[PDB]
Amino acid sequence: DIVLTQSPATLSVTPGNSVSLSCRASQSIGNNLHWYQQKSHESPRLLIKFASQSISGIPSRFSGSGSGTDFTLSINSVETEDFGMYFCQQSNSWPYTFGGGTKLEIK
Amino acid sequence: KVFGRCELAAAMKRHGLDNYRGYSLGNWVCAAKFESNFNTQATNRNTDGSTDYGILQINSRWWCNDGRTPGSRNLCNIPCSALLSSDITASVNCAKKIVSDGNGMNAWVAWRNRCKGTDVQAWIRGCRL
Amino acid sequence: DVQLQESGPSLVKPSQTLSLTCSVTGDSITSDYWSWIRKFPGNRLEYMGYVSYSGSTYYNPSLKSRISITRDTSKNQYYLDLNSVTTEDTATYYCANWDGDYWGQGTLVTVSAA
Numbered sequence: 001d002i003v004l005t006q007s008p009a010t011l012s013v014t015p016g017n018s019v020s021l022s023c024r025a026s027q028s029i030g031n032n033l034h035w036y037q038q039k040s041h042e043s044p045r046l047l048i049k050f051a052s053q054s055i056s057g058i059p060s061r062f063s064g065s066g067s068g069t070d071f072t073l074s075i076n077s078v079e080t081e082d083f084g085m086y087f088c089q090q091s092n093s094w095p096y097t098f099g100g101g102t103k104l105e106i107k
Numbered sequence: 108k109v110f111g112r113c114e115l116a117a118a119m120k121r122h123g124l125d126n127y128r129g130y131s132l133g134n135w136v137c138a139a140k141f142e143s144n145f146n147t148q149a150t151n152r153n154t155d156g157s158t159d160y161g162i163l164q165i166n167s168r169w170w171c172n173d174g175r176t177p178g179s180r181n182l183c184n185i186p187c188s189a190l191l192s193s194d195i196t197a198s199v200n201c202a203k204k205i206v207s208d209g210n211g212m213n214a215w216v217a218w219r220n221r222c223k224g225t226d227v228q229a230w231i232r233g234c235r236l
Numbered sequence: 237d238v239q240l241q242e243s244g245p246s247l248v249k250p251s252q253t254l255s256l257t258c259s260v261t262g263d264s265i266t267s268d269y270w271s272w273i274r275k276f277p278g279n280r281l282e283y284m285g286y287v288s289y290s291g292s293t294y295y296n297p298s299l300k301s302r303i304s305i306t307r308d309t310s311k312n313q314y315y316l317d318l319n320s321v322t323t324e325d326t327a328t329y330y331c332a333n334w335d336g337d338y339w340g341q342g343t344l345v346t347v348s349a350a
Contacts, residue, residue, distance in 0.1 A: 001297075028125070028126070029123070030120075030122075030123025030124065030125055030126070030127065031121070031122060031123035032123045032127065032203075034336055036336070042341075042342075043330050043332070043339035043340060043341055043342045044273075044281075044330070044332075044336075044339060045339075046335075046336040046337055049200075049335075049336070050123065050200065051123075053196070053200075055337075067121070067123075085279055087279075087281055089281075089283070089336075091203075091207075092123070092126070092127060092128070093126075093128065093129070094128065094294050095283060095285075095294075095296040095297060095298065096283040096296075097283065098280075098281040098282070098283065100279070100280070101279045101281075103279075169289070180264075180266065180267045180289075181267065182267060182268060182269075182289055184268075184335065184337075204269070204334065204335070207269065207288060207294075207334070208269070208288035208289055208290050208292055209288060209290050209291075209292020209293075209294075210290055210292070
């Protein structure tokens with residue numbers, strides 16, 4: 001299966017600062033990588049689709065980039081409502097697989 | 108917009124169709140060639156009142172909503188007009204959902220009749236990708 | 237607009253079949269592809285599978301073919317059956333549309349001898 005590796009596993013930041021989260025695939029997946037946010041006691045929320053395409057209703061501070069095997073999710077000026085888990089998921093090949101997640105916490 | 112063969116091959120690769128769900132890039136370029144002759148503005152009104160839209164001739168009865176087709180289902184959750192842009196983003200997004208059904212690329216009649224079983228790789232050969 | 241909600245037992249025994257239901261409100265199930273995803277302890281997400289408009293299904297090989305995803309148009313809902321469960325199947329189960337735009341609230345199912 002396509003293996004997705006996310007780093008760092010955890011990242012602490014002070015609100016107002018920006019961060020970038022990494023997701024690397026074991027093989028090329030084109031632009032077929034979606035990013036999800038998940039807070040405790042909540043279901044995942046789609047933030048970015050197909051590596052860099054925006055999602056209606058998501059804050060503009062969230063952006064995605066990358067192609068092939070290297071992708072990143074960037075948050076321009078983190079807000080308190082952004083703390084939680086972030087997962088990347090590939091849809092290039094079946095079975096769909098998820099990265100192990102990156103926890104974003106207040107420093 | 109009318110794409111050049113190699114121009115579309117590079118664009119589709121950029122849009123992640125190089126090996127999407129088991130289908131090599133040539134399949135998509137070949138499909139576009141026979142479905143719309145590489146024309147992003149191509150439209151074809153069908154008998155059932157539905158219309159095929161764009162470079163990949165996506166149908167208004169199952170995939171997009173053009174607000175004029177009977178039992179429309181809008182499986183792609185998008186307006187057909189979005190599939191008529193010179194920007195292939197929306198068509199690719201929807202085509203990916205279509206091919207994700209068990210029927211795969213058989214959804215494209217032209218692809219089935221003129222591409223399936225042929226050396227589809229030829230469609231991306233001789234191109235700077 | 238669309239709403240999804242999981243329902244079913246929260247406690248099951250080893251070896252039995254775990255069954256969950258996802259009720260869809262706001263539109264017909266015949267108008268989208270439907271999926272099941274689960275979260276194991278330690279923030280590990282696993283895509284279980286999905287059923288597309290033609291009835292075709294795609295199941296994660298990790299489930300070793302113990303999974304079944306079906307639909308019921310009349311009740312506008314779809315289901316998840318997982319046979320011969322073990323404690324390794326304890327997780328929070330979520331239903332969601334294929335696009336990833338709509339999700340249920342998720343439901344914890346614990347597999348225990350007690």
